[PDB]
């Protein structure tokens, strides 16, 4: 059965990007998916997006610009502390110059570079580059 | 064959014996590394690209 909705959303975008398609449809929608998409959009990796109401959790249509190399999920939501975050970005990123880990923290869902300014740890959700 | 097969020590016992022909002392320590550097880098004679090793006999 469907054990996790965020893993479907990112796998669906990742297969559409590799085929060269200009749009994709995500279903079911969730509060976690809308907040994750917003972090990719603010850094310039995807275009703007629209939500459809249907009285059953809803759907999203997203616009693609061709810049995204990958996006992905870490399935157990492991806890991270500021001293251990260096080991995770050494494992998951392609260079020290670009790409982002996404964390959930009591100050909100955010970019791993913002978590250092806000002096906060959290749980891992995923990444993009 | 002379005597039996499975006789131990045969070839070391047959071999004709020759005394050492050396006389002069070799260098030690720093002086040997100095000599090896001058012989391998400082004055050298070029060849065709099929370059030749340090113990070439023929």
């Amino acid at each position: 059965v469907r054990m996790n909705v965020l893993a479907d959303a990112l796998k669906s975008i990742n297969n559409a990007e590799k085929r060269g398609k200009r749009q994709v449809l995500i279903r079911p929608c969730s509060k976690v998916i809308v907040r994750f998409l917003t972090v990719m959009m603010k850094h310039g990796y995807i275009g703007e997006f629209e939500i459809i109401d249907d009285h059953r959790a809803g759907k999203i249509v997203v616009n693609l610009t061709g810049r995204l190399n990958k996006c992905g999920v870490i399935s157990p939501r492991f806890d991270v502390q500021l001293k251990d975050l260096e080991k995770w970005q050494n494992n998951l990123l392609p260079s020290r110059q670009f790409g982002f880990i996404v964390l959930t923290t009591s100050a909100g869902i955010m970019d791993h570079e913002e978590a250092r300014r806000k002096h906060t740890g959290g749980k891992i959700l995923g990444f993009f580059f | 064959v002379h005597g039996s097969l499975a006789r131990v020590g045969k070839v070391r016992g047959q071999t004709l014996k020759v005394a050492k022909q050396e006389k002069k002392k070799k260098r030690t320590g720093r002086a040997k590394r100095r000599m090896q550097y001058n012989r391998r880098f400082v004055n050298v004679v070029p060849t065709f690209g099929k370059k030749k090793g340090p113990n070439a006999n023929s």
């Binding site: - | 064959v1 002379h2 005597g3 039996s4 097969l5 499975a6 006789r7 131990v8």
Partner: protein, 112 residues
């Protein structure tokens, strides 16, 4: 000259067991023997004419060349240790075996 087996395999050099087959006698550490039984694996049971029976082995030079058989006459090398075991050096033809006995070299035990 005449082949005495029959096959494709002319790929060797011919045996030439002929001409200057100069007759060989014992040195120290050797005996004459008669083959009593042949076993597997390149080994045999032999009796020498002063009466000590031994287990005996074909030297690597005689492999697939000098075919030994039951009641055949051979030259054998003794070991300075492990006296129950020995190695074959030569085979004598029935023409050479009678010359050994004519020189009085063999006791009147060997069959020809």
């Amino acid at each position: 000259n005449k082949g005495k087996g029959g096959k494709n395999r002319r790929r060797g050099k011919n045996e030439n067991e002929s001409e200057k087959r100069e007759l060989v006698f014992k040195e120290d550490g050797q005996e004459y023997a008669q083959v009593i039984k042949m076993l597997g694996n390149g080994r045999l049971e032999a009796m020498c004419f002063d009466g000590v029976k031994r287990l005996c082995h074909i030297r690597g030079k005689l492999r697939k060349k000098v075919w030994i058989n039951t009641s055949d006459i051979i030259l054998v090398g003794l070991r300075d240790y492990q006296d129950n075991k020995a190695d074959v050096i030569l085979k004598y033809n029935a023409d050479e075996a009678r010359s050994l006995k004519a020189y009085g070299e063999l006791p009147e035990h060997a069959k020809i």
